[PDB]
Structure formats: structure tokens, C-alpha cells
Design a protein around this ligand. Structure first.
Ligand SMILES: CCCCCCCCCCCC(=O)OC[C@H](COP(=O)(O)OCC[N+](C)(C)C)OC(=O)CCCCCCCCCCC
Ligand SMILES: CCCCCCCCCCCC(=O)OC[C@H](COP(=O)(O)OCC[N+](C)(C)C)OC(=O)CCCCCCCCCCC
Ligand SMILES: CCCCCCCCCCCC(=O)OC[C@H](COP(=O)(O)OCC[N+](C)(C)C)OC(=O)CCCCCCCCCCC
Lengths: 263, 290, 288, 288, 282, 263, 240
């Protein structure tokens, strides 16, 4: 069963599904805990805009920076080589961006961020009751009603309508984004199937070679380091580490301790 | 089986001259069925028929035959009696059947408030509670008088049966020429013979059937134990019909040379039971030539 | 489950409910009668007997006992269904509700309306009756349900006697003792179990050789390899050889020794130019 | 629900509930008395003793002791039932309810009606009593339940003395010693256990020999094959050999050494022309 | 046997889906000329889909198509076999729907005759006669009409279940007649036919098992040819070690083992399949 | 038991059933959670049309995309080879298209999406109450009643009728779609049994051979990568990775680290 | 399963993720335990400033004190050797300062810590009601209302906008600080990949040799002492 789990982990689909589920759970928890939807007459679009965009950027940067392949590509950058580097960087791009896109889609489907962000940009020319010739009380009431100011004074029905409109609009935006995202993915794959010098068989072989070579290199490096130090300690204390030392003991002097202090 | 028990549930038809026909049918039919089952499963009634088959001439007199039916009917009647007793002790079948015959003038536990216009009609409806509340006391007075008689006959029937069994088993030992210890050894022999004979019949048929299947395909698929049976118990042929006919039938303790014989199979094995061809596959070998 | 779907629902409409009762009872009795025929192998070798003769050679006497055994072994299922449907009482109170005579009704004064007698009577099973008539609703229900259960017990009694009379007549008129027929019955059951079980093994071994001839090897499990090793097949049984063991058989005796089956009749050698349905024409015609 | 079937149900009617109480208690005691006699093996050899003699040869002196053992041992079950049915008190309050004298009633003013004294009294056990007489009902119930339990406890007292007096006289009057009768009892319980065991083995080996003569082989279990190999039978014991070990035996001694059973007496040779119930007539009559 | 296991699951599953379908998705569009089409489409359409689906999953139909593309008694068996395994699903759905009675009263409530009712005088407007009747199954009618509604809602329920039982009776007779015709018109005895059916099941079980094994071995050999080495487990390494590579079968030989079988025997010894015909032929 | 499960996964019927069940559950959860049936008078058909159609297309594109063989087929497309490629694409089409049709069928049979989609397209000529000579309030009330505005003012009966009508139509579409798909499926499979050159048994063997050679080629490529990498280690450090390297220690110089930097 | 856990422990991503989780869990309990938003009129910013900075920097001292690599760095520091110390410091730094930024972000996004800290710095110019020309009661009530004083005097509208304005400014600061920390992590990660003489694979080899070198010497040092006692006891009483 553990081997089956590891095989599923090898496949990316389960990993992206788990990442999306974690992002959904985090969005629901954050919305339940700390939204509070303030009415700040002056600065309220910025609150929702930050809560919508910034978490997406943190997810993007965390996803891209956490992969050492992007570091290796940047180090190589800092022909065939350019194409393989571009393909290698693009390979993990989908897993990098799957989290912020899920975040954005869930937030737009919920619509509360869009409601507390785009309320001050609502239209009042259609409503004669929202004339407010003073040109001042209109914006304060516009910013203050969506938050907690019910004020059942023959206004709530009107405000209810606007909320619905935004909600409807919110949904559309989310839907549109998803569609575009999908299209982008397809065209990206098209590039991966048009600009790739590798044939239908060379890509998987190359990726397996890179992964296998990194794994065997790290294991061999660890083994060689351990072996070099068994020899260093054998010279040092007169006996091999991990062996029986009933034969000889060095009994080192004080000056010897500084010798192994070079590294 | 909750659903199947409600099928045989007793539902008294509260109607006059009608609830005893149902009571007779709901009790007399299960008693008849249990009587038939007792006859069918008893092997002692099929060798009695088999006795009447080959003899075909009324050879057996009244003395042996009447001592065979008494065994067949005595062993069969155990099940109908133990059902006819439980029904009587329950009381439902008797209060339903006799509720219309209770004398209205003989009722008590109240003044004479019982109507006389439709008396049989109201009385028959007592077992179904469908009675006016002014006659509720009369309903329970009848419901106890009839249930008493149902259980009075239920205990007398048990008592009478428990005496007939005592008288039968006492007369069986007194009149039998054998001692009760030899009849106990005889009963142990008939149990061991009728068990080994069936056990070998299954094996001798499977081994015979294995030979025929082998003759068709060339091999027989046999289990781990079935393969042992073929080697351990080989068969060479089938026993003739007259040999089978010499072990089936009644038997009443014939003794040879001062040594008892305990069954027809035992009597046949000693050689004391052993031209015209019947029901042959093909005509005579002389007719085969033409 | 299924009982919810097949639950009995009485249509309280005159001259219409008993048709439903006939369909809700007579159809399951027919289906269980058909299933008993299909499952009984004794109805197929009877067909096989008629298949090869094609001239009605056999007399009525061999067929009459053969046909009787097929119906008797299959009529049990309708009876144990007809009995239960009669002891329940639902299927009979619904069918005979409208035939109840209001003249003979009792347990209530004569308040029965005469404008629609049959219409009201037919509505008793569904409890769609006026409360002024409710005394008759339980009166009519108990009368009909009694006759439903009375017929059920008589059906059990009659069946329990026909079974007794059939078994008694079977033994008395049989040419064999009841012990030889007991041995004969223990043989046929043993032959059928062995014959079918080798027919499965023979097919698997034969199929493996055909697979080996195609792929050059066969993928067998641990036990299948034993079947191939233990039981090697050399060929296939001809169609007339198969046809010599199919049909009906009535205790033909050979040289004083009983025969218990057609396979036993064939094994003793007492059963075994013109070519039919051949793959290819005469060998001379193949050349041309 | 056998217990619910045999549950006591008092018919509250004068001159009628003691007939039921007599039947509902006296019949189960009668059945247990009959079962006790049937199962006991000391009565069948008593019948066997009266069977072979055919002339009442045995005197009443030994016959009385054997009958006393049979009846005394069989009467334990009726007594332990007739005591329980008395300690419960239900069977006696029902039977004696009508015979309570209204004049002797107390725990209430003399309001007890004299119109139908027996009819009202007879319905007390069934709780169907007016609330103005419930004081009398619970007074009568405690009076008649006491007489039931008083009779029940005195019956145990009488039995516990008869058992003590029987055993003391059984030891004082017997010529043997209690340490030898204990050895004798341990022998009769070992002869019977072995004799019944060897009868099953001897019958099975004899039954196997006859079956082998029929089929040519016997299908034996793993353990039954040991019986045939270890215990071969050669014939059946004659009828006079079986008659010599059935009957009543009372401690005869031979040459100073005791004999404990008539099988032991027969084994020493101290028990053992006209042909009876023969299969076939004399060999001279067979020839013709 | 194995047939009852497959048929039993299919028969039970259809009833479960029908019960689920009726409780979550079934609403009579109570109005003339609408519910009749809706009720009809609630029986025939689900049955038709199962009938087509049952055909597609059957392996023998595509074998029949291939034979007909390359092109009596062999066709009798398959049509008695594919329908016996594919027409089960529509029939069980059809009978449960009729026995339930929801769909039929949803359909024929429009055509109920207003003057055919009883227990009272006919009370229906001349223009809205069908409109009132069509709204009976939805149970949205006023309680004043519940006297008349119960008669109609139970009359059509009777007709639905009556048709459900008559369909079962018709089907049960047909299955019996198909069994008789299959055995009576067959050229070989039923004992051999049972053997023939056993051989076909055994051949396909071994053929499928061998083909998968042969493909893996053939693929493994190509890996060795292409790379010079194979990374196989103990079982796979054994399989090639025990199973030499036969090679590529000729195109006619694969075409020789495909098609329909007419039970042609070669000089006495029967051949029960095309593969057996090919193996014995050469 | 696991082998039986692995046998069942090989069967396509169990996989199609699992996919259908997951789609049905997801549709139920989505409809119960994030539908809300907006009452936008101006644009209400757009919401229902999107919720009905767009998820079907997203599931369809996913069903095509996550199948790896699609990219290979497109690359070959980018005689008998054409027939084989078309037949492989047809085979994958079944799994690609099983899910969106299940989504569409379930949504149409439920009816709520269709009720909230085409409400404003209803006809009022049947009901004389919806006169509305002004030609403005009629669309307002028509788009308002279906979602949440019961307004029990002796109009609900009409609204109810409208709902039923729409539901009925919705149901038909679903069944029709089912029927249509079924017929298509039939003839589609028929084409695969007529245009294909291989026999009935040759196709199954050919697919099994394809899967086996693909998996074995991937494993052999990974193993060859491992052998190459390990050869590079034994050349560089002088020992075989993962073995007893107590014999010799290379101690490579600084330049030797640049040697393994080529790939 | 235990081997899998050890492999996950070998990865610092789980260590940072777990440390953040416990800090959040401990913070939520502690914020509701003995915080109370103390109501000091005179100097309440000290309490807020103390709770905002001090708990975070205490875990910095805990992180430095719990790691022995810094001990070797300071001993040598009190060329290639110096350059390697910077990389060793950089790796330790990332795990050292991860916890406070988690604490700083959680408290400041909570808002309650900064409302009770900078309440006295709020401006009353927007509000015509809080004129208070005496300049004494204005600061008393300003430090009074946010702590626990609801003060139903038609001034509560003042406290929500003050709270909402404080809450909004609080969120922007952490998200900017988180972004600034991420950029700082990126550029420092870039400096460590450029100034380091080791390659992308040689650095892993050098770190692997370091971690393997400490354990091998330490276990051999343990064996060396035990072995010497065994002779010492042999010379002491005469048994081994
Ligand atoms: C399910 C059972 C639960 C227990 C209740 C029944 C007790 C069973 C054990 C004891 C019975 C027994 O063993 O019956 C066996 C004997 C048979 O004696 P026979 O006629 O000489 O037969 C030959 C002797 N054999 C069988 C030993 C070879 O029966 C009887 O003599 C009487 C049977 C009682 C039913 C008929 C009573 C009269 C009809 C009613 C009149 C009003
Ligand atoms: C789940 C079931 C629970 C038990 C319920 C039934 C138990 C039956 C046990 C014995 C069955 C059996 O094998 O019956 C055997 C006989 C068959 O007679 P035959 O043709 O001469 O066969 C010869 C003997 N054989 C079978 C050995 C070859 O049956 C009958 O004569 C008829 C059976 C009764 C049902 C039909 C009666 C007529 C219809 C109704 C008319 C009013
Ligand atoms: C479930 C059971 C509960 C367990 C306890 C029951 C008691 C067991 C021990 C006592 C039985 C016993 O020992 O009986 C033995 C003697 C029999 O006398 P004998 O001829 O010398 O027999 C010699 C002893 N043998 C049999 C071992 C060879 O009995 C009696 O004389 C008294 C029996 C008591 C009941 C009958 C009393 C008279 C009837 C009532 C008058 C109102």
C-alpha cells in the first residue's frame, strides 16, 4: 500500500489535487477567521484587492522558489542548452502556479472578497434614491452599507440588489479566469510539443536521467565522505571507526586536536 | 421467520357454525400432514409395501402384519399428538370452535342481561372482542370456561398418552420371547447395519460411476479423498436384482442352528436366503443372431 | 427492496380486482412453474429422445411416467406459492369482495344501501367505506379471509395426500426394491457430479493444447499445471459417442447384471458411409 | 415457548377450578412418575423375571424389595414437582378458593355478601373482584397460600425422614457391609458401562462382516478400521446365553467367594433337544 | 453458476437505480400532451439505452460484425445468448416501472374518461376536463376532488401493474420457448453442448492469460534487443526463461481464428472452435 | 484482494463508473453550495448557461489533457499508421467524453440549472394576468420569481406552472442527450469494428503490447540512466556507489567537480 | 514509516512548517490568556511594543542558543575559511529567524496587539466631537475606550473606524514585511549561490562531509574513552 502511495506521489495529478485541496482549506479558514470586511469610507477597495492578489503572489513565489530545479536553471543561466533549460523550468511551472490559481478561483467563487473590494465602484445613476446632490454622503453610505450597516430604512432592498449584481459579476469573472487559464495551459503544452527538440521518447528519458543522476550522486557523495572520514579517524585515534580497537590506541597529544580543526 | 410465522397464525372467523370448520381445518390439517410425514420418512413402511410387492399372494397373515402397522402408526402418531396437545393447551383453537355452543341461560357473573334475539350470533363473536361493552363480563366468563376445557382435555390427552406408552412398552417386553438385553443388542445391530450399508452404497456407487466416466474421457478428476476410495475400494460389477430383492422386506427374528439371525442381510450372508429372464435389455442370444 | 415493488395493492373496483388477483397470483405461479421445468434436466433428455427418433417410436407408457416426474418435481414451487398467497388472505378478500351478498350480511342492522351494492362492497379492501358501514367492513373481511385460509389448509391437505399416494404407488408398481432404487439414486448423483467435473477438466486440458499450438506456450497456475501433467488428452469424443449417453433410460438389465445409466449402458459396450455436417466434402471430391 | 404453554391459568368458577388444579398438577406428576419407571432398568428385568418363570415361582419376599426400589426411585420426580407446585401456592389458592367460609373472614367488617358466596369467592384468584371486597381478597389469598406452603414444607419434612429411615434400615437389615455394597455398586456401574460399549462394537463388527459379504468391501472411518482389526467376531451368542444374564440377582456366593451379577455368575459357569423359532424345519424335513 | 452471478447483479442494480430515479428525479408535468410524453420517455428511453449498452459490452456481437464484414444455427445461439445477457437490463427496468405504477399513471392520466368514474355524478367542466384530470398525479388538486382523484389514481395504477405482470408472463413463456427451440433444433446433444460451452469459456480464459503473458515477454525481448539488458522481476525473468519467443503470427492465421463457428468436424473427431479448427487443421 | 482490485482497474467499466460517481457527487455539492440562483433581470441566462456548459467543457478538456498518449498522437499527426493513430484517439475518446456527458445529464435531470437559466425566455400569452403594456415590469417579475421571490400574491400558481414547464423541458433534453450520445457511441464503436484492419482479438493483444513496451521502455531508460550515472561515479571517485568502497579513495581535486558539471 | 519520518526530518521545510504551526497555536492561546488589552492611560504603548517585538526576538535568542554551529563560528572568528563561515551562518540564519516573522505576522494580522499599542497615537482631527481644548480628558478617554470601555455615549462610531483603520494598516504592514522577507530571502539565497566557490553539487558534498564528519568522530571519541576505562578497571581491580 505504501508502494502504491509512492507511485501516486510520482504522478503529479495527486500532488496538484492535494495542493488545490490545501489551498481551498486555507482559503475557507482564513475567510472564516480574519476577514471582518471593514467599511473604511476612504480606503476599502485596497483591502479586498490586497486580500485577493497578495496571497496569490505569496503562493506563486513559494511554489516557484521551493523547487531546486529553478535554482539550477538560474545558476546555469547566470541552442540545445537554452531549449533544455527552458523545458526544465516549464516542467514544474504548472505545479508552481496551481496553488495561486486555485486560491483565486475559490475566492472569486465565494465572492465575499469581490463584494468587500468592488462595493465602492458600484453605479448610482440608475437609482434615483442615491442622487445625494451633496456629492459627499453618497460615497460614505456606498462604502459603509456593505460592511455591517444594515439600517433598514427603505434602503436595504436597494443595497441587496447591488450585492446580487456584484455576486453575479464575481462569478462570471472567476469562470472567465478559469477558462482563460485552461486555454493558456493548452497552448503552453503546444509550445512544449512544438519548441521541444526532444522526440516523444527523449523527454521522459532525460527527466529520469536527471533525477536518477542527482540521487545516485548525492548517495555516492555521502558514502565517499563517510569513507574519507573513517580513514581520517583511523589515522587520528589509531583505530577504524565501526571496528574493534582491542589492538592499538593512539592516545593523542594536545597538539593533535588542532590538526583536524582545518575543516 | 417473522413473515412466515404470521402465515400460519390462527385467525378465528367470528361467525356461527363457521368457526369450528376453520378450527377443525387449522388444527386437523397440520395434524394430518405431520402424520403423513411420519409415515413417509419411516423405512418400516416401505419394506412392508415391498413385502406386499414380491409376495403378491397375501402370504403374511394377520399376526406379523398387525405387529408392523402398530409400529408404523405408533411411531407416526407421536408428531400429530404433540401438536394436538399444544393446540389444546394454547386454548385458542377450542374457544374459537366452541364459542357458539355456550348456553346463554347457563351464563353467570352478572344478572340475566344476555340478549335472546340473536344469541348464537353474539356468542360466536366473543373470541374477536367484537362485543358490546355491557357484555364484557359475559365475554370473559365464557373466555375462561372454554379455555379451561381446552386445557382440561390438553392434560388428559397427555395423561392418556403417557399411560398407553407405559402399557405398550410393558406389554412389548412381557410378550416378546427375547430378553430385553438381546433386543437392545439387536437394536444396536440394526442401527450399525443401516449406517454401514448406506455408507458403502455411496462409495460403491461413486467407484462404479468413476469407472464409467473413466471409460468415456479416459480419466476422472477426483479429490484428495476420492482418489483414495478408488484404490482402497475397487469394484468389479453390479449386484444382481434378485440379490437386492433378498435383503429388502420385513423380518421377525428367525434363528438358525441355535444362533440368532438379526437381519435379512445377515440372513442372506449366511446363505440361507439364496431360468426365466425378466426385463432384459435385448432378446435372447439366439435372437441376437437373427 | 423487491417486496416494495411487488407488494400487493388491491384495486377497489368491481369486476376488476379479481383480474388483478389472478394476475398477481397466477403469473408468479406460472413463472415458478416455468423455472421448475427449465432447471430440471429430465425435461431436456426427454426432448433429446424425441429429437433423434423423429417418428414417435416410443409409446405413451414410457413418456407418461417421464412427463409426470417433470411436472411433479416442478409443481412444488407454484403450490408453496399458491398456499402462502391463500393463507395470507389478501389476494382472496380482494378478488371475492364484490361477490358478497348484502342480503346474508349480519353483525349489524340492515343499513346496507341498495343504490350501489357492488360498488360499495368492492371498496372494502381499501378501507374506502363510510363509517356507518364500518361494522360490515370487518364482518365481510373476516368471512372472506376465513374462506381464503380454509382453502389454503385444504390445498395443503390434498397435496400432502397426493404426495403420499404418489410415493406409495411408485414403490408398489416399481419392479425394483426400495433399496436398489436408493442405490440407483446414489449412483446417478455420483455419475453426474463426476461426469460434469471431468468435462470441465477435459475442456481445460484440450483448450491448453490449442493455446500451446498457437502461442507456443500456455500460462497455467500452480493447480492447472497439475491438471495438464496428471490428465493428458489424446483426442475428442465423436458426436455419436456423445449421442449414445443422452436421452431417457428405464433400467435395462443385461445378463442378470443391472445397468444404471446410459453411460453405464455405453461403458459395457451395449450402445456402440453416411457422414453429416462434415467440414469438407468426400476426399475424392476434395481433389476435384 | 413451552413454559408459556404450560403456565397455570386458573378457571375462576365454582366446582371447576380444583378439577383443573388436580389435572394441571396431577398429570405432570403422573407423567414424571411413568417416565421414571420406564427409564429405570430394574423394572425390565423384573418383567423379564416374570416372563421366563410364567408361574409366579418367585416369592413375595424378594419381589417386594425390587418393587420398592423401582417405586421409591421413580417417585422422586413427582415429589420434587408436587412440592414446587405447593410452595408456589398458585395451584392451591385456585383449588380451595370456593371453600373459604365467609363467616370466618376477618380484616374487615362483616360486609361479605351471602347471595352467591361461592361464585364471588371462586373468582378471587383471577383478581376479578370488586374494590369494596379487595380487603377480603388479599386476606383469603394469604390464608390459602400459607396452607399451600405449609403443606409443601411438611412434605419435604416427611420425605427427608423417609429417606433417612429407608437408608438406615437398608444398612441395618442388609447382610453385607456398607464398604462392600459400595464396591458392588462400583462394579454394576462398570459392568453395564463396558457391556453396553462392547455391544456397540460387537454389533458394528458383525454388521461390517455382512455388508462386506454384499458389496465386497466396507467403507469404514479411520477409527472404525481399528475395531475390525483389533476385535474380530466369529459368530452370534445363542439365545440361552442372553437369557442367562437378564433378570434380578440378589448376591449369591459360591465356595466362599461372592458373585456380584448374573453375568459374573454366568462367567463362572454356574448358569449354563427342543428347537424353537427356527428359520427352517429340521434337516430331515428340509430334504423332502 | 457464473451466469446467475452476472444476471443477479444486473437485475438488482437496475431495480436500485429505478428506485433511486423515482425518489430523486421524477416529476409529472401535470398538463395535457406533456405528461404522456414524459411518462412514455420514463420507461422506453431508459430501457433503450440499456439495450444498446448491453449489446456494446458483449464480446460476441463485434465478432459477428467482423464475420459479416469478411462475408443459421450459429446465429441462433448468439442471438439467444446476447439478448439473454443484454435484454435482461431493459426488461427488469421495464417491469419495475410498470409494477411501481408511477410512470403509467403519469402518462395515461390525460386520456381518462371523465364520465367513466363512479361513486358520484360526473363533475367535470367541458373545457377544463383534461386539465383537471392531468393534474391528478401531482396531488395538487383541491381536496374537494379527492373523492374522484382516488378512483382515477388507483384505476390507472391497476392497469400499470396488470401490464407489468403480463409482460413477465410473456417473457417467461418466450424464455421457455427459446430454451426448447435451442435444444430441439440443435444438431448436437445437450450433454455435448454443455461441454462445448465449457470449452469456449476455458479457451478464452487461457487465451487471455497467455496473450497478456506473451505480450509482456515479447515486449521484454524488444527491450533486450534495443538496450542489451532487461530489468525484470523474478516472475517476469522466469516467463521468458520458460517461454521461448514463437514470433509473429501470419496475418491469415489471426484471420483464421476469428469469425463465427459452424461446428464443422474433421472425420469424426469434433472441433469446437476456430482455434481448435486451426490447431487440428495444421 | 489487491490483485483483484488491480484486475478491476484494468477493466474500463469500473473506472468509468468511479468517474461518473465522482462527477455526480461533485455536481451535487457544487449545486448545493455555490449556485444561489441569482435574480439578475438583465442577464440571468448567462449564469445558467455558464453553470450548465462551461464545467462540461472543462471536464472534457481535462479528460483529453491528462492522458499522456494524446500528446504522442498529436505529434504523430503533426495508411495503416493513420488508422492506428485514429483508433487510439477513438479509444481515449471514450474516457475523455464519459465525464462531461454525465455532468450534462445530471444537471439537466436535476433541472435547477435549467430553471434558473431560461426563465426570462418564458411566454406570458397563456396567462392574461401578465399583461404589462409597459413592457418593462414583466421581464422584472419573470426573472424575479424563479430564484427566491415567491411573492404570495395570487401569482405563485402561474410561477409554479412555469417552473414545471421548464423542468419538463429540461428533463427531455437530458434524456434526448443521453439517447443521442448512446446512438453515437454505438455507431462510433461500429466504425472502430469496420475501418480498423486488425481483428477482434488482434486489437486487444496490440493494446497490451503497447502498454507493456511503454512501461518496459520507461523502466529500461531509468535503469540505463542509473548504469550510466554509476559508471560516471566509478570513473570519478574510483568506486561503485552503494558498494564496499574500503579499497581505494580518489580524493578528487577542485577541477574534477567541473567535469561532472557538463550534464 | 519511522525511516520516512527521519527522512522528512532531514528536510528543513518540515521543521520551519512545524515551528510556524506551534507559534501560531501558542500565540492564539496566549493572546486570550493574559493579554486583556491593558488599559493604561499613561504608558500603554510599552505593553503593546513589548508584546509585539520581545516574544519574537526571544525565540531568535532561543534559535541561536540551540545550535552549536554558531559556537564554532564565533570561536574561529574571535579567505576560504571565513567565506565558508558566512555560508554556514546563512544556512543557520534561515532557520534561526523563521519563527519571529511568523509570530510578527500573526500578531499584527490579528490586530488586537497594535490597537492596544498605538491607540494613544490616533488623531482626533477627523472627529469634531473630540475637541477637548483642555487636552487632558481627550487622552484619558483615547486610552480608555479601546481596552474594555464600550462607553455608550454616541462615540462608539469613533472606536470602530479607529479599530478598522488600525486593522487595515496592520494587515498592510505584515504583508509588506512578509514580501520584504521573501525578497530578502531570495537575494540572500542569490548571494549564497554566487559568492560561494562551491558549485550547485559541490556545496552539497561539502555539507554532507561536514555532517558525516561530526558523527563519525563523536562516536569514535566515545569508543576511545570507554576502551580506556576498560583497561583502567583492569589495572584497578584486575577484571575486564
Ligand atoms: C417430538 C416428541 C416430543 C416428546 C413427546 C412424545 C414422546 C416421545 C417418546 C415416547 C413415545 C414413543 O417412543 O413412542 C413409540 C411407541 C411405539 O410403540 P409400538 O406401537 O409398540 O411401536 C413399536 C415399538 N418400537 C417403536 C419401539 C419399535 O409409541 C407408543 O407406544 C404410543 C405413541 C403415542 C401416540 C399414540 C397415542 C394414542 C393416540 C391418542 C389416543 C387418545
Ligand atoms: C420449498 C418446498 C417446501 C416443501 C413443500 C412441498 C414438499 C413436497 C416434498 C415432495 C416433493 C416431491 O418430490 O414430490 C414427488 C412427487 C412426484 O410424483 P411423480 O411424477 O410420480 O414422481 C415420481 C417420484 N420421483 C420424484 C422420485 C421421480 O410429487 C407429486 O406427486 C406431486 C407434488 C405435489 C405438488 C403438485 C400437486 C398437484 C397440483 C395441485 C392439485 C390440487
Ligand atoms: C431433582 C432431584 C432433586 C435431588 C434430591 C432428591 C432426593 C434424592 C435422594 C432421595 C431418593 C432416594 O435415595 O431414593 C432411594 C429410596 C428407595 O428406597 P429403597 O427401595 O431402599 O431403594 C434403595 C436405594 N437405591 C435406589 C439406590 C437402590 O427412596 C426412598 O425410600 C424415599 C424416596 C423419597 C420420595 C418418596 C417418598 C414417599 C412418597 C411421598 C409420601 C408422601
Amino acid at each position: 500500500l505504501n508502494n502504491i502511495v509512492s507511485s501516486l506521489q510520482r504522478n503529479g495529478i495527486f500532488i496538484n489535487s492535494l495542493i488545490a485541496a490545501l489551498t481551498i482549506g486555507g482559503q475557507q479558514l482564513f475567510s472564516s477567521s480574519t476577514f471582518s470586511c471593514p467599511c473604511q469610507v476612504g480606503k476599502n477597495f485596497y483591502y479586498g484587492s490586497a486580500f485577493l492578489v497578495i496571497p496569490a503572489l505569496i503562493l506563486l513565489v513559494a511554489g516557484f522558489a521551493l523547487r531546486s530545479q529553478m535554482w539550477t536553471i538560474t545558476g546555469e543561466y547566470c541552442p540545445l542548452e537554452c531549449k533544455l533549460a527552458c523545458l526544465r523550468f516549464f516542467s514544474i511551472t504548472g505545479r508552481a502556479v496551481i496553488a495561486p490559481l486555485t486560491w483565486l478561483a475559490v475566492t472569486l467563487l465565494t465572492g465575499t472578497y469581490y463584494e468587500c473590494a468592488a462595493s465602492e465602484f458600484a453605479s448610482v445613476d440608475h437609482y434615483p434614491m442615491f442622487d445625494n446632490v451633496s456629492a459627499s454622503k453618497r460615497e460614505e453610505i456606498l462604502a459603509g452599507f456593505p460592511c455591517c450597516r444594515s439600517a433598514p430604512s427603505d434602503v436595504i432592498l436597494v443595497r441587496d440588489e447591488i450585492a446580487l449584481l456584484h455576486r453575479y459579476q464575481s462569478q462570471m469573472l472567476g469562470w472567465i479566469l478559469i477558462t482563460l487559464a485552461t486555454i493558456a495551459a493548452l497552448v503552453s503544452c503546444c509550445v512544449a510539443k512544438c519548441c521541444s527538440p526532444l522526440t516523444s521518447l527523449q523527454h521522459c528519458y532525460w527527466t529520469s536521467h536527471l533525477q536518477n543522476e542527482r540521487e545516485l550522486f548525492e548517495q555516492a557523495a555521502e558514502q565517499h565522505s563517510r569513507l574519507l572520514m573513517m580513514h581520517r579517524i583511523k589515522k587520528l585515534f589509531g583505530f577504524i571507526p565501526g571496528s574493534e580497537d582491542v589492538k592499538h590506541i593512539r592516545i593523542p597529544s594536545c597538539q593533535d586536536w588542532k590538526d583536524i580543526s582545518v575543516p | 421467520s417473522q413473515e412466515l410465522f404470521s402465515v400460519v397464525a390462527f385467525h378465528c372467523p367470528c361467525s356461527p357454525a363457521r368457526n369450528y370448520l376453520y378450527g377443525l381445518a387449522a388444527i386437523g390439517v397440520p395434524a394430518l400432514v405431520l402424520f403423513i410425514i411420519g409415515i413417509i420418512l419411516n423405512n418400516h413402511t416401505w419394506n412392508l409395501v415391498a413385502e406386499c410387492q414380491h409376495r403378491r399372494t397375501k402370504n403374511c397373515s394377520a399376526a406379523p402384519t398387525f405387529l408392523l402397522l402398530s409400529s408404523i402408526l405408533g411411531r407416526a402418531a407421536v408428531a400429530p399428538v404433540t401438536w394436538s396437545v399444544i393446540s389444546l393447551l394454547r386454548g385458542e383453537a377450542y374457544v374459537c370452535a366452541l364459542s357458539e355452543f355456550v348456553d346463554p341461560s347457563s351464563l353467570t357473573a352478572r344478572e340475566e342481561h344476555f340478549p335472546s334475539a340473536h344469541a348464537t350470533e353474539i356468542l360466536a363473536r366473543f373470541p374477536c372482542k367484537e362485543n358490546p361493552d355491557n357484555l364484557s363480563d359475559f365475554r370473559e366468563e365464557v373466555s375462561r370456561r372454554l379455555r379451561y376445557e381446552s386445557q382440561l382435555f390438553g392434560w388428559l390427552l397427555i395423561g392418556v398418552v403417557a399411560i398407553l406408552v407405559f402399557l405398550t412398552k410393558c406389554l412389548k417386553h412381557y410378550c416378546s420371547p427375547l430378553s430385553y438385553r438381546q433386543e437392545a443388542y439387536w437394536a444396536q445391530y440394526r442401527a450399525n447395519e443401516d449406517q454401514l450399508f448406506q455408507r458403502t452404497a455411496e462409495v460403491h456407487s461413486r467407484v462404479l460411476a468413476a469407472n464409467n466416466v473413466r471409460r468415456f474421457f479416459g480419466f476422472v478428476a477426483l479429490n484428495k479423498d476420492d482418489e483414495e476410495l478408488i484404490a482402497n475400494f475397487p469394484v468389479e460389477g453390479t449386484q444382481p436384482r434378485p440379490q437386492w430383492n433378498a435383503i429388502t422386506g420385513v423380518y421377525l427374528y428367525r434363528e438358525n442352528q441355535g444362533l440368532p439371525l438379526y437381519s435379512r442381510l445377515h440372513k442372506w450372508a449366511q446363505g440361507l436366503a439364496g431360468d426365466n429372464v425378466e426385463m432384459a435389455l435385448l432378446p435372447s442370444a439366439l435372437e441376437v443372431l437373427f
